[model samples]
Target chain A: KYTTFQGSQNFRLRIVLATLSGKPIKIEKIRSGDLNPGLKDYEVSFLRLIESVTNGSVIEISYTGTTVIYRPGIIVGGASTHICPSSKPVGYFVEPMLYLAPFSKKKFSILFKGITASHNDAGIEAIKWGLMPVMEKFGVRECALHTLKRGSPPLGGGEVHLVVDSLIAQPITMHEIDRPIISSITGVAYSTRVSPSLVNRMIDGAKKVLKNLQCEVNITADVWRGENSGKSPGWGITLVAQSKQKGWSYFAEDIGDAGSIPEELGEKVACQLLEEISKSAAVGRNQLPLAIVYMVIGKEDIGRLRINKEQIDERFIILLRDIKKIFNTEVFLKPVDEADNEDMIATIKGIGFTN
Target chain B: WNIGKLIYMDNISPEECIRRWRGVDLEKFVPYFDTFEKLAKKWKSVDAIKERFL
Candidate 1:
C-alpha cells in the first residue's frame, strides 16, 4: 500500500523490512469519545475534527502507559480551506488550521501539529504576563473587565480582524505596526495581517475569560500618532464602567500619576485617540473596530525592569506613578534626548497624549 | 455541578448562569435590602468628619 506522506528515508526501509515478517498490522479503532469527554467543548471539537481528518490513513502510534504519542507527517497533498472544525462533519476544512491526517487502527490518536496545549497556553500565558504590568500601571478599573478583539475575513484573500478590550491604555492597536515581540515569538512576521475583525475576536475572547477580573476597554486610533499631538501633550478619553453605576460613564483625566486613576480611564484614552484618528482614516466607528492595546515602558527603562511575579503588581503601580510624574513635568524622569524614547504611553494617556 | 462544562442554555436560567459563571449561591441574586439599610446607618456617623472636610 502506498501512503501519500513521504516517509522518512529510514522509515521506508523499515516498513519494507517489517513487511517481510508478513503479520498484518492489527488495526484497533478507538472512538474519540473514549478520551476526556469533559474537556472544554472547543478542545473536544478540535480533536474530533482532527480525528475525522486522519480517518482511514494508516497511522503509527505508540502508548507508553496512559500517554500516547504519534509520528509526524507532512502535507504532501489533499484539501483546501484547512481550518478543520473540531467536528465529525466531513468537508469544510481550511488553511492555517489544516493538518495532514494520521492513520491509526485499533487506537486513533490526536496530537496538535505545530500547536499544543502548551503552545496556545503559552500564547495565552504571554498575553496574561505582558498585559499584567500594563493593567497595574494604568490602574485597571475595578468595575470593568478588559477586552481585546481580533478577526480576519475569509482566508481566500479577505480582511482579518483582531480586537482587544481596554484600547485606550494599550499602545498598539490593530492599525499600529506590531512590534518585534510578536514576530520573535510566533515566528510569523508581524504585518497588517493583524486585521480589525481578528482584533475584535481577541477582545471578545479576552472579555469572556476576564469578565470577573477588573479591567476597562480602551480603543486605539488607527492612525496612532496624529491625535492630540499639538495641544494636550497626551490626548485620549477613558470610559469608566462601575459595578455601582448603571451605565458607562465617560471621564477625561490627566495622563499622569498626579491623580488617582479612575476605573474607566483606559476606555477614555481609547475614544479620544480614535476620535482624533478618525479625522484621517476612511473608516466607520470601526464598524468592526479591532480592539487592542500595547504595553510600553520608556525605552531607557527597557533593561531596568525584571520579569518576576512577586513584584509585578507593585512594580506596575510604581511605574505608572513614576511615569506619570516624569512626563511634561521637570524631574529626574525627564525624556532622554531620543524623541521616540521620551514618554510612557500610559502616563501620556493619563495626561491625554495619544501619540 | 460539573465546573468545566456547566451548560448555560434556556433550560439553565439566568439564575443558573450567575450561579455557575460566578460560582456563587442563588441567594447572591436577592437584593440585600436589609443589610444595605443597616449599612446606611453608618453614613450618618461620618457626618461630623464629613462636615469638617466640607
Candidate 2:
C-alpha cells in the first residue's frame, strides 16, 4: 500500500518508516508554501544516503523538487562510503541511520567524511554516548562510531566510520517506571586545529559547572592537532549524564565559532546538560523520538516507556500524528501521579515489523 | 553558569528558573495533548502507482 504525506516536515522519520514497513510513500508540497519551495540541499544529500544502504530502492523527486515518491528496498547493509555534503553536520545523517542499521541484513558499516560537528546539530560523540544505553534496550547490543578526524563547521572535511550490529532478536518490551537519578556526569571538550590551552580552559569551565552535581565527573580534553584536525578550525563540548537506571542517559552539546571564547562554550554546554537532566525521563529530549520509534516497530507485545510531559514539544506532537498515518501505530498515555511527580507513561503495541 | 541552576536539575521544575530564565511571554509550542491527535485525510490516502515511471 502507498502512504501519502504533505509538507516538508518529518522527512527523516517518514522515509525511515517507509523502509521498515515496505510501503511506497508519496510526499508532496515539501516546503511548498515557503519562498524556497522544495527539498533543501541537506534533504537531497539524505536521499543519496538511504539509497546507498538499500538494494533496489527507488527515490523519485519532481523537477521542481516539491514531490517525492519513495519505493524502499531491502536494507542490505555492507561496506559503504559517502562523503557527506558540507551543508549539514554528520549528526544529521548518523542519527537516522542508527534506526535502520540494526535491521540490515549484514553488518552496517559506513565510512562518512564531512562536517562532523555543528553547533546546532547532535555531535557524533554525543550520539555515541547516548546511543549505547538506548540501543541496548531493544536487544541491539553492539554498535560503534570511530572518529578518524574531527571536523567542525562551515569549512567541512572530517572523517568518521560508524558500525551497527545486526539485531539478534525482536525488540523486547520495556517497563521503566522508576524516576531517574543521575549518578555520574561525563563530558568531552575537544579542540581542533587550535591551541591545546583552549582545551584546558574549556575543560576547566565544564568542570566548574559539573562540580555542583557532586557526582563522579569524568571529563576529557581532546586536543586535536596536526593532520587529525580537519580543514576547519573549531572546538566544542559534549556532555552525557548517566542515571542510576540502565536505559537512562541525558546529553547536550554546543560548538564555538570565531571570536567565541572557549571557556564560555564549555559553560554553555554544561548548563544545557543540566537542563536536560532537569527535564528528566527515561530518555533525554533527543532520545525520545528514537525510543518512541522503536517502541512502535517492535514485537507485537506492548511496550511501556516513561516520558516527561514537557518534552512533548510541537515537533514531537506532530510526530505522534505522523506515526499514526504511516505505521498506524498509536501510543496509549497514562499520567504518573505522585507528590511533584507528574509525568506521562506511553504504552504502545508494535506491528511486529520484520524484513 | 551559576550554582543555583545546577542544583535544580535533580528533578522537577523550579519557579526561579522558569521565571528568570524565560520571563518573556511565549506562545505554547504544543498547546494541548490532543491538539494534533487526529490525522488529516490526505495523509491517510493509500493509492497505488504505475510501474516503470517517475
Candidate 3:
C-alpha cells in the first residue's frame, strides 16, 4: 500500500467517483493536518460531512504526486503569492509537484487549511463570489474547491511548494477514460458556409439530453447548475454544439453530483447516447463534420478505475474515428482540462457551432 | 529586472492573464499589464471579476 507518507505505517486516504450529468467526478480526501484556511478547509469539512451522511461508504485513497506551483506577483504593496501553472502540465492542469500514495475511492469535501484571501483576490473571489453564480448559471455542483498556501516550500520565481507529508483525496473519480457523446441533432445555417447554427444545434442537442433527464435549462449561453438535493442534485448537464466553416462539433457534460450512480451505468449512458446521437446526426446530413466529446469526472479516482489517462485518450480517439466513419465526419474524444478548456463554452460559439 | 526590489503593479483580470499572457496581441506587442489583466480574468467567475491585484 503506497500511502502518502513514504514511511508512515498508519496513514490512510480515500478517493471516490460521483456521476453528474452522465460524467464521472472524483472526490479526494487526505487525512492530515495540512489544511489551507479557505477552500481547502471547506473541502475537508465537506468531506467529513459526506462521510457522516453516507455511513463512511465512499472511500478510496491513492497516493499520487500533487504538484503545486506558486509564483509571486506584485499585488497591493509587497510581492503577493500566486498559484501559477506548474512547469509541467499534467494530464489536466499545471501542478507544482506530484505525490504517490494508496487511498480509498470516494469523493470528499476535504479542506486545505491556511489558504487566505491574500493568496489572490481573483482566486478567492472565484470561490467566494464568482463560483456560486457560475454554478448557478451552469447548473454545476458536486465539485470541490481547495485553498493552498506556500506552507513549506520556499516561494519565489516559478517555485513549487509541495506538501510532501499531506494527503489529498476526492469524493468522486477524476475525469474518466470513456465519456458519452451527446451530439447535436439540430440543423445549422452557416454564415460563410459556416454559421452559428451548428453550435446552436450542438447546444440544443445537449439541452435535449438535459431536459430528457428532467434537468432545468438556463437561458444563458454559459453553463449552470440545479439545486443540491436528492431529487435535484448539485450536478447539472450541459449540451454544447460548435461549428467552424470547415467542420463542426457537438458535446454534452454532466456538471456536478447528487447521490451516487454506478460507474458502469454512467459510462454506458454516455457511450450509448454518443452512438445514438451520432447515428441521428448522420441521418440529418449536418453530422458533426468533426465532433469531440470530453468528460470532466471527479478527481478522487485518479488511479483505481479500470481506465487511465492514456486509455481515455485512446478510447476517445476510437469513438471519434468510429463516429467519423459512420457519418464520414471527423470526430475526436478528449478529457476536459480546466486550463485548456478555459474557453470550452465560448469555443462552441466562437468556432461557429452555435445557433 | 529587479528580482526583489521591483514592485510590479498587476492590473488585469485573472482570466485575461491566463489566456493572453503568453499569446500575441493585436497590432502591437501585448503589454505586460494588459496581458496580466486578461489572464487574471480567466480565473474569475462568470458574473464578476473574482479578485484584483494592484
Candidate 4:
C-alpha cells in the first residue's frame, strides 16, 4: 500500500522522503485546474535524475501526467553527472541532493550544468554560503561545493560540482538559537553579456541601503565574458548576511530581466536580506526546510529553533504530517508570546535515522 | 490504538504474537498498520484460510 498525496507543491521533499523511507507513494491531481495541467518538463527531468542515482526505483505516470506512482529503491550513491533542466536553477537539484548525499553507500560527486542563479530557487550562492555549512554541522566532513561557471536563465551553461565524503550520520542538537551580533555582510553582484559597470552600480545601490546599518558590507563585482557568460544576457545580485557564529547565514537574491535596472535589483536584494536578518531566527526562511529535515532524521534529541509564522505555511504542515506518518516523529510548534505573534519556537525529537 | 492493542485484538497468544512481531521486518511492515489490518480483515472475511497437511 502506498501513501497517497495530492498536488505538486513540495514535490522534491516528498519524493526524497519517500525514497529514503523506501515507501511507495501515489500523487494525484497535479495542477488539475491549471491550463497546462500535469507535471512540467523540469519535474520529469527531476525524476529521471533520481532514477540515474538510485537502483531499481520504479516511477509510473498517468497518460495525462496528472497522476504518479513511485516505488523507491535503495540509495545507491555513486559518481554521476547530470544536466539540470534549463527551466529551473541548479539549486532545485542541489537542495535535495544535500539531504540524500550523506547517506549514500559510496561517495557522491555530481556535476550539474544549468541556471546557477535565479529568482525562483535558492541559487548557487545559498548552496555555497548557507547549505554546505549546515551540512558540516551534521558531521559531514571533507565535502566541497564549487561553482565552476556561473549561468543565467533562458539559456543556461553554468557548471556546479559537489562532492560529499561518506561518514557516519551524526544527530544534531540545536536547542538554543543564539542571537549573534552581525559581523561583516558579503555579496556578489554578477553580470554576463552586459556592461561591467552594471555590477558596480548594483553594489553601490546595495551599499546605499546597508550603510545605515552599523555593519561592514563587502560586496564583490563579477563580470563573465565570452563563452563563460552563458547564452542569455542577464545580471543579478546575491547578498548574504553573515552572523558572528560560523555556519549561520541568510541569503537574498534578485535577477534582472530586460526591463530591470541594476540599481533597483541591488536595492531589492539588499532590502530583502536586511528583512531576513531582522527576523532574529537561527536560519532564514530558505533554510527552514533543511533545518526541519535535519531535526527529523537526527539523533533522538530535542532540536529547536525560532522562526517566523510565514515559514510554517501549508507546505510545512503537510511535510510535518508526512514525517509523522513515515518516520513516527513529531514537530512541536509553540508561539513565543500570547499577544505579540510574529515568530514562534519549534521543537522536534528525532527518530535517530542512520544509514 | 497502539501496536500491542491491535495485535491483542487479533486474538493471537501474547507469547506467539511477540515472536511473530519480532520475526517481521519492522522497517517494511510497522509503518503500514492500516494497510495490514485491511488486508488481514479481507482475508478473514473471504475464508482464505486453509489447513496445512503434514
* Per-model TM-score versus the true fold: 0.19, 0.84, 0.20, 0.81
lDDT, candidate 2, A86-203, per-residue tens: 8778877877788888888888899888899874566877778886578877778888889988888877778888888755545667777766766777878888888889888888
Cα deviation of A144 in candidate 2 (Å)? 0.6
Off by over 4 Å in 2: A244-247, A353-355, B1-54
A1-355: candidate 3 lDDT, tens digit per residue? 1111221111111111121111112322333334421123222333333333233233333443121111111111111223332221111111101111112123232222222111111122122222222221222233233323211111111122112222233122212222223222222111111223332443443343334332233322321122111111122222223222212233222221223332322232233223323323211111111112111212311211112121222222333332222222331222234442221110110111111
lDDT of 4 by residue, A1-355 (tens): 3688778866887788888778888888999999999898878888888887789999999998999899998777777888988778877787788888887777778888888866567667677777776677666666777878878788888888988885456435766444444577898888888878989989987887777655678998889878878777888888987765655677777788887778877776776666555443667766767777877877878888777654544345555666766666667766665454446677878766432
Highest lDDT against the true fold, candidate: 2
Q: For model 1, how does the per-residue alpha-carbon lDDT over A27-99 read when each residue is reduced to its tens digit? A: 1222234454222333334334434533332434324111112222222222322232322111111111211
Overall lDDT per candidate, in order of appearance:
0.22, 0.72, 0.23, 0.70
Candidate 1's displacement at residue B25, Å, is: 26
Report i-RMS for every model. 23.9, 22.5, 22.4, 27.1
A best-first ranking of the candidates according to their TM-score comes to 2, 4, 3, 1
List runs of model 4 lying over 4 Å from the truth.
A335-343, A353-355, B1-54
Q: Which residue pairs does candidate 4 place in steric collision?
A: none
Weakest 10 consecutive residues of candidate 3 chain A by summed lDDT = A88-97
Instruction: Please give the range of 10 consecutive residues that has the lowest summed lDDT in model 4 chain B.
Output: B24-33
Q: Give the TM-score of candidate 1.
A: 0.19
| Candidates 1 onward: DockQ, in order | 0.02, 0.02, 0.02, 0.01
